[PDB]
Protein backbone atom coordinates (compact mmCIF):
# COMPACT_ATOMS: atom_id res chain seq x y z
CA UNK A 1 0.00 0.00 0.00
CA UNK A 2 1.84 3.09 -1.44
CA UNK A 3 1.23 6.80 -0.45
CA UNK A 4 4.20 7.96 -2.64
CA UNK A 5 3.34 10.70 -5.14
CA UNK A 6 2.58 14.36 -5.84
CA UNK A 7 -0.90 15.24 -4.58
CA UNK A 8 -3.23 18.18 -5.18
CA UNK A 9 -6.35 19.13 -3.17
CA UNK A 10 -9.99 18.58 -4.35
CA UNK A 11 -12.03 19.09 -1.12
CA UNK A 12 -11.53 20.68 2.27
CA UNK A 13 -13.82 21.23 5.24
CA UNK A 14 -13.36 22.95 8.61
CA UNK A 15 -9.77 24.15 7.95
CA UNK A 16 -10.73 27.68 9.09
CA UNK A 17 -12.79 26.23 11.99
CA UNK A 18 -9.69 24.18 13.02
CA UNK A 19 -7.41 27.26 13.04
CA UNK A 20 -10.11 29.16 15.07
CA UNK A 21 -10.11 26.43 17.83
CA UNK A 22 -6.31 26.69 17.96
CA UNK A 23 -6.69 30.51 18.44
CA UNK A 24 -4.83 31.60 15.29
CA UNK A 25 -5.22 35.36 14.77
CA UNK A 26 -8.16 36.07 12.38
CA UNK A 27 -5.88 37.86 9.81
CA UNK A 28 -3.33 34.96 9.84
CA UNK A 29 -6.29 32.52 9.55
CA UNK A 30 -7.54 34.30 6.37
CA UNK A 31 -4.03 34.16 4.82
CA UNK A 32 -3.63 30.45 5.76
CA UNK A 33 -7.08 29.58 4.29
CA UNK A 34 -6.08 31.32 1.00
CA UNK A 35 -2.68 29.53 0.90
CA UNK A 36 -4.19 26.11 1.87
CA UNK A 37 -6.62 26.24 -1.13
CA UNK A 38 -3.70 25.36 -3.51
CA UNK A 39 -1.12 23.10 -1.78
CA UNK A 40 1.38 20.76 -3.41
CA UNK A 41 1.92 17.63 -1.26
CA UNK A 42 4.90 15.40 -2.00
CA UNK A 43 5.05 12.01 -0.24
CA UNK A 44 8.00 9.61 -0.42
CA UNK A 45 7.30 6.24 1.26
CA UNK A 46 9.85 3.36 1.72
CA UNK A 47 8.11 0.68 3.82
CA UNK A 48 7.00 2.38 7.10
CA UNK A 49 9.41 5.32 6.42
CA UNK A 50 7.78 8.57 5.23
CA UNK A 51 8.80 12.03 3.99
CA UNK A 52 5.86 14.48 3.57
CA UNK A 53 6.37 17.98 2.11
CA UNK A 54 3.33 20.24 2.13
CA UNK A 55 4.08 23.38 0.02
CA UNK A 56 2.00 26.51 -0.44
CA UNK A 57 3.07 29.96 -1.71
CA UNK A 58 3.08 31.18 1.96
CA UNK A 59 4.31 28.29 4.12
CA UNK A 60 6.02 24.96 3.47
CA UNK A 61 6.40 22.11 6.02
CA UNK A 62 8.53 18.92 5.73
CA UNK A 63 8.14 15.93 8.10
CA UNK A 64 10.18 12.71 8.34
CA UNK A 65 8.84 9.77 10.32
CA UNK A 66 8.71 6.02 10.57
CA UNK A 67 5.35 4.45 11.56
CA UNK A 68 5.64 3.27 15.26
CA UNK A 69 8.54 5.65 16.18
CA UNK A 70 8.29 8.99 18.07
CA UNK A 71 9.33 12.11 16.04
CA UNK A 72 8.97 15.89 16.33
CA UNK A 73 7.05 18.20 13.98
CA UNK A 74 4.77 21.25 14.42
CA UNK A 75 1.05 21.43 15.06
CA UNK A 76 -1.00 22.89 12.19
CA UNK A 77 -0.85 26.25 14.17
CA UNK A 78 3.00 26.12 14.06
CA UNK A 79 3.77 24.89 17.67
CA UNK A 80 6.56 22.28 18.19
CA UNK A 81 5.07 18.90 19.18
CA UNK A 82 6.09 15.29 19.82
CA UNK A 83 4.22 12.94 17.48
CA UNK A 84 3.65 9.16 17.18
CA UNK A 85 2.11 7.56 14.06
CA UNK A 86 0.58 4.07 14.07
CA UNK A 87 -1.26 1.99 11.43
CA UNK A 88 -4.99 1.88 12.30
CA UNK A 89 -5.48 -0.44 9.25
CA UNK A 90 -3.52 -1.35 6.08
CA UNK A 91 -4.60 1.92 4.38
CA UNK A 92 -4.80 4.39 7.33
CA UNK A 93 -2.23 5.88 9.70
CA UNK A 94 -3.13 7.86 12.84
CA UNK A 95 -0.91 10.40 14.59
CA UNK A 96 -1.20 11.65 18.24
CA UNK A 97 0.62 14.94 19.04
CA UNK A 98 1.80 16.40 22.43
CA UNK A 99 2.96 20.05 22.70
CA UNK A 100 6.67 20.27 23.67
CA UNK A 101 5.68 23.39 25.73
CA UNK A 102 2.49 25.07 26.90
CA UNK A 103 -0.99 23.61 26.77
CA UNK A 104 -3.55 23.94 23.98
CA UNK A 105 -6.33 21.84 22.42
CA UNK A 106 -5.60 18.11 21.87
CA UNK A 107 -4.42 17.76 18.22
CA UNK A 108 -3.98 14.72 15.96
CA UNK A 109 -4.03 13.79 12.28
CA UNK A 110 -4.77 10.82 10.05
CA UNK A 111 -3.86 9.93 6.46
CA UNK A 112 -5.75 7.31 4.48
CA UNK A 113 -5.22 5.95 0.96
CA UNK A 114 -8.49 4.98 -0.82
CA UNK A 115 -9.17 2.40 -3.55
CA UNK A 116 -10.08 5.25 -6.01
CA UNK A 117 -6.80 7.32 -6.14
CA UNK A 118 -7.59 9.64 -3.23
CA UNK A 119 -5.57 10.55 -0.15
CA UNK A 120 -7.66 11.70 2.83
CA UNK A 121 -6.05 13.91 5.52
CA UNK A 122 -7.93 14.62 8.75
CA UNK A 123 -6.61 17.09 11.34
CA UNK A 124 -8.33 17.32 14.73
CA UNK A 125 -8.24 19.97 17.52
CA UNK A 126 -10.50 18.98 20.49
CA UNK A 127 -13.74 18.12 18.60
CA UNK A 128 -13.18 20.13 15.37
CA UNK A 129 -12.25 17.74 12.54
CA UNK A 130 -10.80 19.08 9.29
CA UNK A 131 -11.07 16.64 6.28
CA UNK A 132 -8.95 17.25 3.16
CA UNK A 133 -9.02 15.07 0.08
CA UNK A 134 -6.28 14.93 -2.54
CA UNK A 135 -5.67 13.23 -5.89
CA UNK A 136 -2.39 12.55 -7.72
CA UNK A 137 -0.98 15.37 -9.95
C1 LIG B 1 -0.42 32.84 7.92
C2 LIG B 1 0.59 31.74 8.28
C3 LIG B 1 1.94 32.03 7.63
C4 LIG B 1 0.89 31.65 9.78
C5 LIG B 1 -0.18 30.92 10.56
C6 LIG B 1 -0.33 29.45 10.13
C7 LIG B 1 -1.71 28.96 10.59
C8 LIG B 1 0.72 28.55 10.77
C9 LIG B 1 -0.24 29.34 8.61
N1 LIG B 1 -0.60 28.15 8.07
C10 LIG B 1 -0.59 28.06 6.78
C11 LIG B 1 -0.95 26.80 6.24
C12 LIG B 1 -1.32 25.78 5.78
C13 LIG B 1 -1.63 24.48 5.27
C14 LIG B 1 -1.65 24.23 3.89
C15 LIG B 1 -1.91 22.95 3.43
C16 LIG B 1 -2.09 21.90 4.34
C17 LIG B 1 -2.37 20.54 3.83
O1 LIG B 1 -1.97 19.58 4.52
O2 LIG B 1 -2.98 20.47 2.72
C18 LIG B 1 -2.09 22.16 5.70
C19 LIG B 1 -1.81 23.43 6.16
C20 LIG B 1 -0.20 29.08 5.95
N2 LIG B 1 0.15 30.27 6.43
C21 LIG B 1 0.10 30.40 7.76
Residue numbers in the entry: 2 to 138
The authors write:
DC645 was developed as part of a library of synthetic retinoids following the EC23 archetype but lacking the fluorescence-enhancing elements used in earlier series (including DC479). Instead, a tetrahydroquinoxaline derivative offers enhanced hydrogen-bonding opportunities in the mid-section, creating interactions with solvent and Arg60 at the mouth of the binding site, which is likely to help to stabilize the protein–ligand complex. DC645 was chosen for co-crystallization owing to the increasing evidence of its positive effect on neurite outgrowth in cellular models of Alzheimer’s disease. The incorporation of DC645 into the CRABPII binding site, fully engaged with the binding triad, is an important step in understanding its interaction with the retinoid signalling pathway and indicates that the molecule will be transported to the nucleus. The ligand-binding residues and the carboxylic acid motif of the ligand are very closely aligned, with a slight deviation of the tetrahydroquinoxaline tail groups between the CRABPI-L29C and CRABPII structures. The structures presented above may also offer some insight into why CRABPII binds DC645 with greater efficacy than CRABPI-L29C.
The cellular retinoic acid-binding proteins CRABPI and CRABPII act as gatekeepers and facilitators for the passage of all-trans-retinoic acid (and related derivatives) through the cytoplasm to access retinoic acid receptors (RARs) in the nucleus. The retinoic acid-binding ability of both CRABPI and CRABPII is centred on a hydrophobic pocket created by an orthogonal β-sheet fold and capped with a pair of antiparallel α-helices formed from residues 15–35 partway into the sequence.
